């Protein structure tokens, strides 16, 4: 039971934040974490713990390559880029239980660093 009441409030909140249906034009970006900052600023909504943690791991997964430096938007186009993160986020606003998050949270000592603050109205 530890973490539950916080993981309950946090998942009962995010499930309520609607995924935006009207989209803007292509957002240049150079990391997945960078891209998603551009989306919360522009659309004014938080992304879930699970979306911010998977995007740190997409970015981390690039280190170590042999190729020379290449902007990520030369690889993944900003149009499906954005779409991704709007699809990953929906799964996350709907499907996980709050017992899951408390679980994960009890195992990640930095979990609050992947939770967004309160956004404006």
Ligand X SMILES: C[C@H](CCC(=O)NCCC[N+](C)(C)CCCS(=O)(=O)[O-])[C@H]1CC[C@H]2[C@@H]3[C@H](O)C[C@@H]4C[C@H](O)CC[C@]4(C)[C@H]3C[C@H](O)[C@]12C
| Residues 42 and 24: beta-carbon distance below 8 Å | yes
Q: Which of 29, 114 has the CB closer to ligand X?
A: 114
**Which of a second copy, ligand X, none does residue 6 bind (CB under 5 to 8 Å by kind)?**
ligand X
When binding is defined by CB under 8 A, the residue of 6, 84, 115, 116 that contacts a second copy is 84
- Asked if 9 touches ligand X (CB under 6 A), the answer is yes
Helix H or strand E encompassing 57: helix 49-60
- Asked if 100 touches ligand X (CB under 6 A), the answer is no
User: How far from 83 is each of 19, 26, 75, 115, CA to CA, in Å?
Assistant: 11, 10, 15, 21
**Which of ligand X, a second copy, none does residue 33 bind (CB under 5 to 8 Å by kind)?**
none
- Asked if 10 touches ligand X (CB under 6 A), the answer is yes
DSSP secondary structure, 61-97, as one string: TTTT-SSPP--HHHHS-HHHHHHHHHHHHHHHHHS--
- Asked if 80 touches a second copy (CB under 8 A), the answer is yes
Q: What is the DSSP letter of 27?
A: P
When binding is defined by CB under 8 A, the residue of 29, 96, 111, 114 that contacts a second copy is 96
Site residues for a second copy per CB under 8 A: 50, 54, 58, 60-66, 72, 75-76, 80, 83-84, 87-88, 90-91, 94-100, 103
């Amino acid at each position: 039971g530890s973490l539950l009441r916080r993981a309950e409030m946090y998942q009962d909140y995010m499930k309520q934040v609607p995924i935006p249906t009207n989209r803007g034009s292509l957002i240049p970006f150079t990391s997945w974490v960078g891209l998603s900052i551009s989306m919360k600023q522009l659309y004014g909504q938080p992304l879930h713990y699970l979306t911010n943690v998977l995007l740190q791991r997409w970015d981390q997964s690039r280190f170590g390559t042999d190729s020379e430096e290449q902007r990520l938007d030369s690889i993944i186009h900003p149009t499906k880029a954005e779409a991704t993160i709007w699809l990953v986020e929906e799964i996350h606003r709907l499907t996980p239980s709050h017992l899951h998050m408390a679980l994960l949270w009890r195992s990640d000592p930095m979990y609050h660093s992947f939770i967004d603050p309160i956004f404006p109205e």
